[PDB]
Amino acid sequence: GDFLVHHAIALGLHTTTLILVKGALDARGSKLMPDKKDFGYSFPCDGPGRGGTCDISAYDAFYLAVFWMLNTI
Amino acid sequence: QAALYTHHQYIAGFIMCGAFAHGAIFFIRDYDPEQNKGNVLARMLDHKEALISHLSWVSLFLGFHTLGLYVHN
Amino acid sequence: KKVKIAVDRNPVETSFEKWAKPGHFSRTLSKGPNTTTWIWNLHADAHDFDSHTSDLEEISRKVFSAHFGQLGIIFIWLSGMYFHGARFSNYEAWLSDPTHIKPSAQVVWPIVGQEILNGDVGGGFQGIQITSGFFQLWRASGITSELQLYTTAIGGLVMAAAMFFAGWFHYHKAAPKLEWFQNVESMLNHHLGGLLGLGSLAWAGHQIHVSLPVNKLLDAGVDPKEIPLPHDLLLNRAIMADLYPSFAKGIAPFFTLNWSEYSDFLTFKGGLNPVTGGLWLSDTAHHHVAIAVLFLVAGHMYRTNWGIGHSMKEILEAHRGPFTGEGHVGLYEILTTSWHAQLAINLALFGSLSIIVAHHMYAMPPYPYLATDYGTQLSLFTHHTWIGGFCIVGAGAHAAIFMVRDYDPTNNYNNLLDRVIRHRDAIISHLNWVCIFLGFHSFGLYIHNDTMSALGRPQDMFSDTAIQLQPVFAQWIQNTHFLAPQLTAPNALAATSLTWGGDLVAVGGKVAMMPISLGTSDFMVHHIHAFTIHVTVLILLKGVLFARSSRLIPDKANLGFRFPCDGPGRGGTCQVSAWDHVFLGLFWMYNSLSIVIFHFSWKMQSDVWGTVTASGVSHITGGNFAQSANTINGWLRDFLWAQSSQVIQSYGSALSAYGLIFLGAHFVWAFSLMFLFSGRGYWQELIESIVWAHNKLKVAPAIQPRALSITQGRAVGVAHYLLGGIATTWSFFLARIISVG
Amino acid sequence: EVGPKRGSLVKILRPESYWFNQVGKVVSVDQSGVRYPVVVRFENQNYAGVTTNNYALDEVVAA
Amino acid sequence: AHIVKIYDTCIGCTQCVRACPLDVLEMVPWDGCKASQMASAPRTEDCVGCKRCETACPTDFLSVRVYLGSESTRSMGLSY
Amino acid sequence: WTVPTLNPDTPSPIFGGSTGGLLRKAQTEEFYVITWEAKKEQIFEMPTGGAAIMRQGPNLLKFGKKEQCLALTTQLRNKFKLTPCFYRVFPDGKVQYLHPADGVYPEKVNAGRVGANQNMRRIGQNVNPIKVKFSGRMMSPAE
Amino acid sequence: DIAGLTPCSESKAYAKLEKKELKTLEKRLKQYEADSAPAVALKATMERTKARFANYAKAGLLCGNDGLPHLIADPGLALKYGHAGEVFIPTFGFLYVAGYIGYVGRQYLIAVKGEAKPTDKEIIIDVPLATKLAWQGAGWPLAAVQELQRGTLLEKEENITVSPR
Amino acid sequence: MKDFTTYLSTAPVIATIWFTFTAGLLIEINRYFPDPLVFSF
């Protein structure tokens, strides 16, 4: 049981830091939004164009990582 | 004991989410790619897709197999 | 003549070349995939026939043939149920002892240890205890054999083949023209007189000749093998006369208007059969005869090809007042030119009908040994309630689709639709206010009671003891229907239901139905129901009335019915679409019907269902709905936490699948929250960082991986939310009520 | 003349472009002294659904 | 107000101006060192921020960019 | 071409009234007037919700938002091929001609409108936010 | 004797669990007659149970205080004490099949990249090509190693990247 | 019937057939070799 729950803990840590690292490294731009640094840390979106850009900013990656952090802890 | 552990672990999770949040805020607001020409910090953004895809693989593997063993049991 | 058969001959070549070309129906999908969004759009647009073409004839033909496909599939499903009752059932054993044997019509293969689900249901049989009520329905029809179920299954497969042939025929060989579909007067005449009138008359005949005698002998203790077969009752009038003496007189009393002679098998007893706990099948037969006559006269109302009858256009264009301007002018064209309007109305009334069915089948159990099969009863109520809620949300959806696509302001000037769109602000403002008022004065009552009980002040609660909120109107209606056979329905022997009042009907020691007492908890939960319904209506009606335009976005109709947003501007216009109003009305319909079925389950297990051990009724939960349903903590403790002891302790039992699906539905529900709480922009960037790793190893697909559209993200989220929640409640309910009932 | 030929394969060196380091087929090069004369059609569309884009002589490289 | 900038990758397709529901953009001649026309944004005080313009821009990356700035009654699209 | 002055004696389409019309904003800060000349009496859709009949000849309409006026403009131009122009009206009585500011519609060129907010660089040529940091107000590198 | 784990052949909780499961099954069996369909089913289930317990105790599995077999993931402890068939052998057994699947799909992608519309060869599968590659993917480890040593498994810096690299 | 076999080669049909095959293979393996917790044969 400790094995399984420690691996769940590892999944939580790894996914939380995945979301956070991916919001930190894609923070200055991506392929979907290469000029993201010009829009700031927090900003709503870039519109429904280019397929849809809901939750595109690094702030949104943090906001998505807080759920996974709460689940990890 | 229970309260102290849960307290400090949730505090730690929030603080650790904020660490990466402010790392992203740094990359957007404070990071100069010209004054960090070729150092470890730029070398991070250089292979950021590798980092993110490998964190994706570890998260995916741990989730698949932890959930699968739990569901099997 | 104006009402005639009109078809095109061989309009569409029967060929497999368009099977091999996915997305043929669309000009935007016929170009082949470049992204996976194409793979999703091919399925989202498959049945949006009004977006394939724009002429109503081909749309209507596609709709007709797809309805034939749906009917063929329903027939396959029915034949499968009858076949599983004929082959994988304990039905012949259940007829001989229906009070002890659990109905089961699904056997599990012994492969990975799952033969534990083949439980000891009774009758020397091992299988899954079904909750569909098919055994009681078959006993009401007078089956008494597996051979009859097998032949009904074969007939159902034949009819499914017929339906699929008819779809192929009415699309590819002889497809009706548009003027044939627009014969709504004749369609209504035939669907009232023929579909419902002749159908109810034929079922009444079956009940006169097959169901009533077979069940009168079954209720007399006769073993099903000693019972005459239905054809022996059809041929030999002496047997029927021995059971019902009026058959000695023949059909002469019908033609001589001496109908009272038929009071042997056409009764108005009311109440329940004390042997089975179901409705009297003589009352049911008389019912079907009556409504058959009623629908047959109703189907002679509309004018088709002779001068008699009504033109629905005239009725509409004549119904207008000083408050409503032109009135119903232009609605005949709406409902003869737009399929989505018809679908809106029809889904609305079909879902309301399913919920009415749920409420009427538990209070007046129509089938024998259905009321004491508490699992069947609970499952049927829950099922039809859910189907109704879904149909109603779809009615909202398709009303919005009509408003966006098929609405034309030229045909609607100062009529009811124009005048509704013209004061939509008042409608929605008052609906918002009543939703807030109801939310407060319904849920804040529960919060007040929770706070008082936690504070140590039970004398300050809204309880049946401290501050009584008695539903006196419902109590008066109960008392009025209970006393109906005395004053206002004197030819009825008993009330329609025992829920109005009176004594209980106990079948096999268990309560079939007993008076339901309404108190403060019932007041509170009924106002909770009204609240949730009003909020669902708010969301869906706001999506309908603000589908074309708003004060935020005046050209919303050009963006379409199904669009994510207009942008992050105007502060943010996320979910301004009508599709998103359906998306939210789904959550609120779930939250409404969950409480509906929770109220039903707890009320039944506390105040109706139970055993008669001595002279005195011992209910399942003990009658705790009255004093514990005043608080949220009572619903959590005395209903959710208490009644979960059967679904979480089911491991190692035949109910272990219910615990497994409980956990898995929890999982699916929580998994929905990844799609609901998140947005497409994170997932596209993650997908491109993964596509990097695939490009590095030369396994980057040519169909470019995209994240799900915003609309598709929301759809996946709400689908997984509904599935998880509903399946969680499904497992909880069934594991609870198969054990305790 | 300037620019690759009207059927040549060309690799994109604009970083903000969806087809950065991706090979596209040249449609047209504007011989007028304009910014971004090279028209490159790609066999995979971008996030907006567009398959072609205009690129400068700096931002394109042979093969 | 919102900041609507237009960059020198504009091809003069006019679709951004066609798609703007607020008449913020227009087409001006020969300001871009380009073919005939280039897009302009002279009325960004009426821009709500819908980004319908840069949904309609075919260039990669966008030649029209909307940066959501300070909100007002016009930028928030208020009839009240 | 010169700026047309709004004629207030222009009639209005036949409309039975709604609840989506003007609010206190019209009384307080500003509202909008759109005028057009119709060749025949036609039923059109109001952006406020409802169907109105535009009169043969000139038609005046009041709205509380510019997006409403341009929605009706695009409807009249795309479904009826009319040529509407709308104004901004203040409770002061000041009228500001808005939509065809040059006389032609902005999707076509008129040779005499000056370009504004045109960055003469690529969108990937913007400076990093660390270069525009502490610019007074919070700014984007696009300026 | 690896981590305080006793063999399941010597553990008493293991035998207790066996007899408990068998008691459950025979208490279900008492309700039916001699040779009913349920009786046949339950006797087959009892035989499967006894066989499963015998085959887990025969396989040298280690049991805890609960009498449940515990697997040894560590190579070196699994190979020293004969527990390689628990996690170690099935590890490579799985990896063979997973690399099989991945290599076959990779070869299919690379083979259909050459066609004029590579996308319609992915929604509509080239079944003869797919079956050829599925059959010849049995040597996926050797082919993958030889494709790794030629530098042709990996793509060079022709993959696409975001503006800050 | 070139078009019919093109339809059967579509992603959903091929997926259905292949996963019916894989699931049937696993089910038959688990019928003839029941309860395989470890590799011991």
Ligand code: CLA
């Ligand atoms: C040493 C600690 C530290 C410091 C100095 C800062 C400082 C800053 N952060 Mg960072 N941050 C931290 C920790 C810290 N943060 C942690 C731990 C997290 C993770 C939780 C974050 C996550 C974070 C994000 C995601 C962002 C910042 C931002 C900011 C900046 C402005 C924030 C602001 O306006 O506050 C205003 C804050 C509030 C008004 C508080 C909001 C309410 C919170 C949720 C608490 C509510 C509690 C509630 C009342 C409890 C009710 C209980 C009751 C009912 C019983 C500032 C530079 C922002 C920034 O720089 O933008 C570019 C930004 O976007 N921070």
Ligand code: CLA
């Ligand atoms: C129970 C809820 C739940 C679950 C299961 C997941 C699952 C996942 N999340 Mg999280 N997430 C959740 C809630 C949840 N999330 C919530 C509430 C949020 C807030 C919005 C997020 C926000 C979030 C972010 C921001 C990220 C994730 C990521 C992930 C993935 C992590 C890798 C992993 O564990 O792979 C294992 C996979 C699973 C456990 C799910 C699959 C389940 C089984 C194994 C699949 C097969 C089932 C069955 C055969 C299907 C039948 C279909 C049909 C026949 C009916 C995974 C898909 C990360 C990601 O996607 O990158 C990898 C990531 O970056 N999630």
Ligand code: CLA
């Ligand atoms: C073999 C007989 C046959 C053939 C060759 C065709 C051929 C054609 N039909 Mg016709 N059709 C047939 C039988 C046939 N049809 C029947 C029996 C019906 C009655 C339902 C119809 C009704 C019909 C309509 C209404 C339409 C067509 C159309 C078409 C064209 C393309 C359809 C397509 O893409 O198919 C591939 C599609 C499928 C394979 C989907 C089949 C879905 C079935 C009916 C339901 C199965 C549901 C399933 C149980 C759900 C399971 C869920 C899962 C999770 C378990 C083509 C000319 C369309 C067209 O545009 O023609 C020009 C069109 O609009 N047909």
Ligand code: CLA
């Ligand atoms: C007495 C005549 C009659 C009857 C019984 C029906 C019955 C039905 N019609 Mg209606 N219809 C009629 C006349 C009739 N129609 C006329 C005159 C028109 C032209 C205006 C239409 C136009 C029409 C449309 C446009 C649609 C229907 C649909 C339906 C079906 C609705 C689903 C349902 O209730 O399932 C109940 C199911 C049953 C009771 C099963 C028995 C089905 C039997 C075999 C068919 C009924 C007899 C048939 C109408 C006469 C032709 C027989 C055939 C052998 C030639 C239902 C079967 C809908 C549908 O689902 O289409 C398939 C639909 O979309 N009908």
Ligand code: CLA
């Ligand atoms: C659709 C519903 C339905 C049907 C089918 C029947 C059918 C029947 N009822 Mg019932 N009945 C019904 C409703 C129905 N009833 C209702 C609603 C009531 C309440 C008022 C009753 C009350 C009732 C009583 C009280 C009695 C019956 C009786 C009968 C039987 C005598 C029929 C008769 O004399 O009428 C005459 C009918 C016909 C003349 C039609 C026959 C036409 C044939 C089929 C023509 C085919 C010829 C073909 C072209 C050529 C040959 C084909 C081939 C060989 C070449 C018959 C089995 C009597 C009986 O004996 O029951 C056992 C009886 O006593 N019924």
Ligand code: CLA
């Ligand atoms: C008589 C019933 C009826 C009919 C004929 C239609 C018909 C239509 N609807 Mg309506 N609708 C209905 C009921 C109905 N709907 C109900 C009850 C709801 C509420 C849920 C809706 C909500 C709704 C919305 C919100 C939309 C439509 C749309 C449409 C159109 C295209 C749908 C499509 O292509 O999906 C093809 C089929 C699918 C994509 C499959 C969906 C599968 C669902 C999501 C999963 C559930 C499966 C199962 C129960 C769960 C277990 C599965 C298991 C494997 C895990 C079509 C005109 C769309 C439209 O017109 O677009 C403009 C649209 O946007 N409908």
Ligand SMILES: CC1=C(/C=C/C(C)=C/C=C/C(C)=C/C=C/C=C(C)/C=C/C=C(C)/C=C/C2=C(C)CCCC2(C)C)C(C)(C)CCC1
């Ligand atoms: C369950 C089911 C099934 C079966 C069913 C059935 C079997 C049905 C039947 C039905 C029927 C079997 C019907 C019948 C009908 C009949 C009728 C409907 C009749 C009528 C009559 C009338 C209406 C009359 C009139 C008159 C008179 C009264 C006298 C003289 C004159 C005249 C003629 C006018 C199947 C297999 C499908 C499967 C699914 C389910």
Ligand SMILES: CC1=C(C/C=C(\C)CCC[C@H](C)CCC[C@H](C)CCCC(C)C)C(=O)c2ccccc2C1=O
């Ligand atoms: C998780 C998630 C995703 C990512 C989900 C992905 C893109 C969909 C995955 C579906 C399946 C797994 C891919 C289908 C691939 C093949 C068809 C499967 C055949 C082979 C299998 C055996 C692997 C979004 O794109 C998204 C968008 C908007 C709001 C919320 C979300 C969201 O929550």
Ligand code: SF4
């Ligand atoms: S849907 Fe996307 S683009 Fe539209 S407002 Fe929401 S986040 Fe912004």
